[PDB]
Design a protein around this ligand. Structure first.
Ligand SMILES: O=P(O)(O)OCCNS(=O)(=O)c1ccc(OC(F)(F)F)cc1
Ligand SMILES: C=C(/N=C/c1c(COP(=O)(O)O)cnc(C)c1O)C(=O)O
Ligand SMILES: [Cl-]
Ligand SMILES: [Cl-]
Ligand SMILES: [Cl-]
Ligand SMILES: [Cl-]
Ligand SMILES: [Cl-]
Ligand SMILES: [Cs+]
Ligand SMILES: [Cs+]
Lengths: 268, 395
């Protein structure tokens, strides 16, 4: 969890927001995914959000559904994902790495054993998309025992009780949801979130990253201007992978151009 | 926090994205309030009696038990308006949707019987109904697609994954997570996140209450066992609930064996799966060794689902209820037997329950036993699929 603390301290010094891409590990294959991730980092990614392919990702829209499917077509398993995470950490000692999990993959062979493996490969946070705060106790306890930040969701319909819980329970960063619905670049968030950002800061929550529907540099700037510590973009990144499956070279060139632009938008 | 216990032992819970928790809490509050509201209860009772036709008959077989000491009654949910037990709890949930000010209904359907129930209640009560249905089921349960569309509902084919009930369930939840302010998710079985397993049971429990009163009137005693097929668990928990405290009454749930348990092409997670977390609930799952949710298989679209409701997992764990499986071929033979020797065309789902009852009788034909099968629906949706299968044999 300390890699996030170090990142946000450095970004605060430079009056900078964080830009955090999401991709599915192993999409479209293990080798190309590792190259994709190296390009995301070289182009300016401040941290990573990394999905482990799951059979039924019910918080994801079609773009990331298809990313999961491509990884499965390449035979990618959670065990291979942990192999990949070790290789990423070996190359990149300081970048914060957060996993996007669904509950059954964490629960399957023991919750404690899952977070132990996260600690052994050098993961910094885990977000379990289908575990609300009300069900979170064994997950967040296991995370903290293994020095893993448990990532909580602050939705736009959050009441005061929820803001206080996520501020107290969370570590690393607070996930500020742009909108209702599932992941996807096509639906862009509607209501401003200034109130929630300010309450989270009042309650000493982990710094807020906005996500869902962030697909353009203007949206990244707007998140920072509204007071958030940064922004996460997944479907817009994955769309570049989908569009360039037959040209891996062009795929990385467009990913680099997009990430650098999205990162530039986070700089004051 | 919740008003009611979300768990049955270790099973159950509310494993949904945080965004959906206010909708679940709102639904739970509306349910608790409605259960105390005499006006809601009277409207629900009125619809069940004068619109749906309750109470349903309890029919004594006679031909198919001849030469044995089994007495077999069928609880005739096939006679309910819509053609299946699904109508009972749809009427209650539709009233809940209106109580919460929702104007739209989302539903999943496999057999199409819950889709038809959702469409007819939405037509009656003024709701705009959209129904997700796997594309395989759109074909093999096609009569219910025609019925849904003729009542004005939107039927959305789902081509993803196995293109069956699980995949429809995924799309329904994904939709709800972005539309819950206006749409109520009318989940069709006793599964999913709390409060659905509780609501669905309470809105189906008249099945077992009527059965108890009817058996006592006709036989002067409780049944030895009540038998029901188990997809997500609604018709079985509806039959079981009023008998749970009558410890002499066996509670037998029948999961689909598909092509045979040993083939892995089945829908029997309660006896052949492993506890996991999916579709909002901690419950037995068909899953791979590393925790991917599998695809199920059954000849019967209504049972073709890789999990089961949490109260059944709990009743099994403590030994109060016993669960078994019946294969495609066993279900088909029971379907033919009921058509030809009692003049009732059963749903293929319900045929799994009947097949196990006929096995209990045939295996021990001198055992005196008084049995009730929940005949959860009629087989009009299955006649073209079954006819094709039998024609390909010869029969
Ligand atoms: O840019 P988009 O719209 O594709 O957003 C994708 C971001 N990916 S992620 O791992 O942060 C992410 C975060 C939360 C999710 O569900 C939950 F909110 F319920 F937890 C799902 C994915
Ligand atoms: C899956 C559906 N129904 C299932 C069903 C079932 C299995 O569902 P429950 O376990 O919830 O009763 C049993 N009997 C009939 C007539 C059914 O239609 C559906 O119509 O969507
Ligand atoms: Cl491939
Ligand atoms: Cl904190
Ligand atoms: Cl009541
Ligand atoms: Cl329509
Ligand atoms: Cl009484
Ligand atoms: Cs008999
Ligand atoms: Cs099932």
């Amino acid at each position: 969890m300390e890699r996030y603390e170090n990142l946000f301290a450095q970004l605060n010094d430079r009056r900078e927001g964080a830009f955090v891409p999401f991709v599915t590990l192993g999409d479209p294959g293990i080798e190309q995914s590792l190259k994709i991730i190296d390009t995301l980092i070289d182009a300016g990614a401040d941290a990573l959000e990394l999905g482990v392919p799951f059979s039924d990702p019910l918080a994801d829209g079609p773009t990331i559904q298809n990313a999961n499917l491509r990884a499965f077509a390449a035979g990618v398993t959670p065990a291979q994902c942990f192999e990949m995470l070790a290789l990423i950490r070996e190359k990149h000692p300081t970048i914060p790495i957060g996993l996007l999990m669904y509950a059954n993959l964490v629960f399957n062979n023991g919750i404690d054993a899952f977070y132990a493996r996260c600690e052994q490969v050098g993961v910094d946070s885990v977000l379990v998309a289908d575990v609300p705060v009300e069900e979170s106790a064994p997950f967040r306890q296991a995370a903290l025992r293994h020095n893993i930040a448990p990532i909580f969701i602050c939705p736009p319909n959050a009441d005061d009780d929820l803001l206080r819980q996520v501020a107290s329970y969370g570590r690393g960063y607070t996930y500020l949801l742009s909108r209702s619905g599932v992941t996807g670049a096509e639906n862009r968030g509607a209501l401003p979130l200034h109130h929630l950002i300010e309450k989270l800061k009042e309650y000493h929550a982990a710094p807020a990253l906005q996500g869902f529907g962030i697909s353009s540099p203007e949206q990244v700037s707007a998140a920072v201007r509204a007071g958030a510590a940064g922004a996460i973009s997944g479907s817009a990144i994955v769309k570049i992978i989908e569009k360039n499956l037959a040209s891996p070279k062009q795929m990385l060139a467009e990913l680099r151009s997009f990430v650098s632009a999205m990162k530039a938008a986070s700089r004051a | 926090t919740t008003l009611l216990n979300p768990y049955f032992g270790e099973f159950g819970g509310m494993y949904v994205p945080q965004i959906l928790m206010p909708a679940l809490n709102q639904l739970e509050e509306a349910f608790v309030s409605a259960q105390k509201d005499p006006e809601f209860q009277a409207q629900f009772a009125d619809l069940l009696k004068n619109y749906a036709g309750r109470p349903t008959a309890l029919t004594k077989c006679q031909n198919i038990t001849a030469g044995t000491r089994t007495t077999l009654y069928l609880k005739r949910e096939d006679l309910l308006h819509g053609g299946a037990h699904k109508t009972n709890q749809v009427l209650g949930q539709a009233l809940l949707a209106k109580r919460m000010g929702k104007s739209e209904i989302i539903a999943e359907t496999g057999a199409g019987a819950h889709g038809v129930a959702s469409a007819l209640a939405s037509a009656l009560l003024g709701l705009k109904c959209r129904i997700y249905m796997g594309a395989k089921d759109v074909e093999r349960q096609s009569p219910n697609v025609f019925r849904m569309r003729l009542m004005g509902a939107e039927v959305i084919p789902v081509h993803s994954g196995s293109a069956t009930l699980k995949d429809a369930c995924n799309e329904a939840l994904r939709d709800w997570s972005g539309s819950y302010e206006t749409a109520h998710y009318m989940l069709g079985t006793a599964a999913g996140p709390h409060p659905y397993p509780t609501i669905v049971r309470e809105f189906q429990r008249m099945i077992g209450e009527e059965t108890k009163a009817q058996i006592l009137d006709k036989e002067g005693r409780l049944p030895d066992a009540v038998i029901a097929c188990v997809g997500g668990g609604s018709n079985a928990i509806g039959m079981f609930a009023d008998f749970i405290n009558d410890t002499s009454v066996g509670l037998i749930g029948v999961e689909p064996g598909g092509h045979g348990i040993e083939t892995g092409e089945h829908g029997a997670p309660l006896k052949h799966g492993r506890v996991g977390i999916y579709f909002g609930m901690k419950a037995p799952m068909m899953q791979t060794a590393d925790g991917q949710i599998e695809e199920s298989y059954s000849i019967s679209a209504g049972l073709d689902f890789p999990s089961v409701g949490p109260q059944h997992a709990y009743l099994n764990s403590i030994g109060r209820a016993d669960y078994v499986s019946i294969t495609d071929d066993e279900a088909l033979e029971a379907f033919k037997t009921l058509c030809r020797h009692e003049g009732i065309i059963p749903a293929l789902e319900s045929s799994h329950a009947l097949a196990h009852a006929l096995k209990m009788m045939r295996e021990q034909p001198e055992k005196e036993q008084l049995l009730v099968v929940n005949l959860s629906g009629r087989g009009d949706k299955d006649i073209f699929t079954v006819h094709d299968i039998l024609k390909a044999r010869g029969e």
